Amino acid sequence: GAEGAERDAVGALFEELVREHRVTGAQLSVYRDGALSEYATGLASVRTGEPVTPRTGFPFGSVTKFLTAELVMQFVCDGDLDLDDPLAGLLPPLGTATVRQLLSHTAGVVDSIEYDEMRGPSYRRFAAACARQPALFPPGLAFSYSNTGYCLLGAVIEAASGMDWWTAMDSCLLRPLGIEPAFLHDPRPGQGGAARPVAEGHALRAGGERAEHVDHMASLSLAAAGGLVGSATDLVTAARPHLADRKTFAQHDLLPEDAVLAMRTCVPDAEPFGLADGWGLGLMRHGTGDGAWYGHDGAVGGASCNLRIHPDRSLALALTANSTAGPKLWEALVARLPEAGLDVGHYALPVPDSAPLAPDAGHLGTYANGDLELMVTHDAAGDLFLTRESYSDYRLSLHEDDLFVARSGEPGALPITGRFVREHPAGPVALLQYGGRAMHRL
Template identity: 40%
Template sequence: MDIDLPALLAGLAREHRVPGAQLAVHHAGETVTAEIGEETYGSGEPVTRRSAFPLGSLTKPFTATLVMALAGGGDIDLDAPLAEYVPEVGPGGRMTPRGLLSHTGGLASNIDEGGEHSEVRRRWVARHCRESAAVHPPGTVFSYSNIGYILAGHLVEVVTGMSWWEATEAILLKPLDIAPAFVVGPPSGFRPQATGHTVRQGRDRPLPVTGQTLPKVAAPSAGLALGAADLVTFARSHLGALSLQAAIDRDCAREMRRDQLTGVKAGPFGMADSWGLGWAIYRDAGTDWFGHDGTGEGTSCHLRFEEAAGTVVALTTNAATGVALWEDLLEELRPGGRAVGGRGLSRPPEPGPRTPGSPECAGRYVNGEMEFTVVADGAGGLGLTTNAAERFELTCFEGLRFTMREPTGGRTTYTGRFLRDPETGGVDLVQVAGRLARRARDDGSALAALAAPGEGG
């Protein structure tokens, strides 16, 4: 390649105060890697190719691949009622394995990290994943769901008789000669693991994150730790690299990359252009790219690949500011035709001109344990408060679209929109970072629940 990757990565890491990072690029049959900095700030332990970074939600494509391996072997039918394999979800028949992997299963977005979590995933599923408790009718909308992937991991355990950790290691990683590390769960051999860091304006040094809040039950959604070179190997196995032993055949891999959202009323606005089975789909770089992003406790990791040339780009960082580093990396790669799919977070897709915030958007919106309260200030402004007591000022655009910057003054920006009821025209939903919350029934301006919500604007 004609780019000095170590120099590029080191410069971006200094700019964004990222203590350590890995970058791996596969192009034209060659993989080039760069590793810079320390696993933990001030520790003196350098980041190496072997260092494992908590992947956060980049764990999900691995869990999806496990499910697809079972589908390819005839052990499950992607479109069968999930209750045929996991009776704990209860009757209904609309929730399917395909819906879980494409985030159209209707389940709530986030696990209540402060709640009670049985370490027996079957018991947790029986309590939290019943189809009758779905927050959206299955198959009608995209709403990003960590809980859906916990259920997908349980499906793997039911069918294989192995734990999710055992299945991940034996079916996916060992054939690719990847040594696993896990954020939570049983140890699987020694592999140095990077520590996440918070980076605050006005402070000289990044602060290591000492606590770990991910419950063991949530491991299939966010529990894996790997390196950038491992991510490249995994993506190349999906592209059918002849030198690698893939867990799934070419047909299953192709199905994972196929757009699954045809006919779905609300897509993954702000996160991607569409979604497959485990993979986000990005169409903003002139060709289809696939991948996923993941944030852990003070880490940010990213993966993109495209089929035509077989190019793969993977970045792992041990700071929350790694998101901004990734955005700048995409801009650095763009000149000379090296555009990588996946727009930055600083503005919504096709935002149009800025507008005042509409007062009709004010109200309380819920998705399981997640809650947003939107308040109009009477002067054309909107504020959004989460149930974690974070408050954001919204920058509004045409079509009821908005961005909201993290309240600590950092650069991370979330993209969202309000959606209208196609029958009444009233605002009934808000979507933030792909998660779709419905106006609460006890809200003074509540509208009737929708069976098939429509696009906003």
């Protein structure tokens, strides 16, 4: 009756919005009321004419972290891996951080580290290279999103099992779920056979009439953080053990209820400022109570991927898209899906109520996350600026609750809403965070 009307409205909504934003191809899968809806449209490649099917694999991007987290949590439940063990005992400063902190981006690892020197399936040499990198702050003091943190989780999985991250991801999680494994880069010889049909990425070029193929360079070492390739339906399947009705899922034993709850349980006193309201083990949270949704986002080149889970309503939905318009399709989907009862949570940055504070000349300094750096400066008039290697200076407004807004001097650049973080109420500024990354005051 009325459920059938809703699935029709969703597919009809998905079709309208894919065309309206001219997405090359997309998949939307919704699990709701115990059953699955699978929508798929458009082109896997514009060059090829090949259509998108539910089999077509899309790059998950950073959505890969939810499966890596799921993989890590499996080893914990078999007792093969300790969520609070220090990394030093697992693989010869960063040695005092924990798997639990890595999962939650609270380990103080920088976001990106050059290891284009990796060639095989082992993450062992990569583990060492992280060690020769200054931490952001001591493990546990603040949220900072880190692809490298999850690449270290690949080394952990490899030392905990005796298999490389690819082999373990395949044999321990993808295979029992029914997911055909595919990767941005697979360094193993492996076996042969027909490869899984994959979607290419696309972006509108100047004067172009439709989005065209775009090449993405993705380093091999990012694999455990972003290298998985699969379908909307695959992501919904991996979400199945997280839902209230998980006893109806035949493979619920694959991820026990206690692990599901842990992945969902957010770290206290470490808000992912500028990305979500909370972060758990491989899931972020948008919203707070009955309105709290969990998931993950990702984008590689001209492709995007979004996953969203509401455990209590036993609802999961995933979107894959293979053009740069994917993100606006996700946004329009979030705003319009309410007209079929699917009110996915939103996250908006705070907008400050108050007037700008007096420019504090103790905020001056250089802040850094790995290679990326920002400078808080002032001019001769004593006004605060944010400088950035190849960008116009931003005007820096300081606000209450240690918030700040940086307005760019070039209108095609985005402004930056972030906050400062102190280690102690009486202490000086030690951190700037925005977009869920921290930057260390040097």
